[PDB]
Design a protein around this ligand. Structure first.
Ligand SMILES: [Cl-]
Lengths: 240, 241
């Protein structure tokens, strides 16, 4: 199980899983801080979807040269063009586009308005760099799984997660055939697979198990442990 | 135990130097042997910058571009096209062992040539950017951080990071007594089996620390490192104080 997986891999593992149907929790270093990478992009996209209706997603934003930052694969092709908010959220959620994320936060009212929304949600732990498995899972439940998003803005966002290929070797490989997973992978720039979060849907249950899995090796940037994350998922899934 | 025997038990090479800065008492075992180190040197570089920047001035910001980014930069990869302060680069280098934060701290000092010159000046003529010895690295952390020139502010800012470091848990912090306070920085090579820990151990009742340096590598480099070795080395060495 989980401390044997610390030994097995020589990694640290932080888990927080929450069945929202029953209130049941699985923890393990839940109150320890990890650097979570692009999984914050799922938060920033849902807070803008709280304020913009699905029909108003056809608003264009103008992209100019100074707006573009490194590791933007879609938005580097938009210097001096306009793009809808919808296509900014697909680029940030499918490609982890950095320019798309910056424009989505600009559009929320700057990072202070994101910080403040989290204080309102009751998360005094998450900051743009690090959070704990526990803080993050609760924020994800309150904002996406049991939040205030319209039927249509929440199907839009979950289908981007449901149809994402990035972490089919992480929580997705780890659960049984018949569970459906909607995940936001870490897809970190400078080091290999380390984080993954998901909404796991039991076959015959509409409510999700929220599952946060943050891991740390330290200093080995090209070794992914896709299998430390799918093993940790398997063992967690027993509890439900 | 004996240290000779832990090498025998875990099939490892151990280098260790301990100095009680209160009495002046040293423990040595493979002291003058050279080991290639990595992230334990981030605490040396953090201490040379805090020697020329007053704590109130740590809010100064540097701009990050794509070309500063290097591999395993857990925190700074989220800052391309952004500024970050100097108190924040040091916390990312010390807490998360971020490599863009370390390189930017070295550039602030004035580069590797001024890190060299500073060591030379502290009397360390052994350490180079590649290897060092347990004895050289131990006298250098003592002369820069425990009996150095840092302000009170900056010496507690730096040790609080090392004290609340969750990546050194399975190493020195795990082998000492229950009421020994341990402030450390870990390190481990990428390409072969190697595991290091340097620390400032505070025995109950004394405010002077023991400086502990433990360098280790498995005799078969293809072997997975075992954190237990550092833990058990630390336990033996502490019995000598
Ligand atoms: Cl990641």
């Amino acid at each position: 199980e989980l401390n044997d997986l610390e030994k097995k891999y020589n990694a640290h593992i932080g888990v927080y899983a929450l069945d929202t149907k029953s209130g049941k929790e699985v923890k393990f270093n839940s109150d320890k801080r990890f650097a979570y990478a692009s999984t914050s992009k799922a938060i920033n996209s849902a807070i803008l979807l709280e304020q913009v209706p699905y029909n108003k997603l056809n608003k264009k934003v103008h992209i100019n040269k100074d707006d573009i930052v490194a590791y933007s694969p879609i938005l580097e092709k938009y210097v001096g063009k306009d793009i809808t908010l919808k296509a900014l959220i697909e680029a940030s959620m499918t490609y982890s586009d950095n320019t798309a994320n910056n424009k989505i936060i600009k559009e929320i009212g700057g990072i202070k308005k994101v910080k403040q929304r989290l204080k309102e949600l009751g998360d005094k732990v998450t900051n743009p760099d690090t959070s704990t498995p526990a803080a993050f899972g609760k924020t994800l439940n309150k904002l996406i799984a049991n939040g205030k998003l319209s039927k249509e803005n929440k199907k839009f966002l979950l289908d981007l997660m449901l149809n994402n290929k990035s972490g089919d070797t992480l929580i997705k490989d780890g659960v049984p055939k018949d569970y459906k997973v909607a995940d936001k992978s870490g897809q970190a720039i400078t080091y290999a697979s380390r984080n993954d979060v998901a909404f796991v849907y039991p076959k015959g249950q509409s409510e999700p198990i929220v599952l946060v899995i943050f891991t740390n090796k330290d200093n080995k940037s090209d070794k992914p442990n896709d299998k430390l994350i799918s093993e940790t998922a398997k063992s967690v899934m027993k509890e439900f």
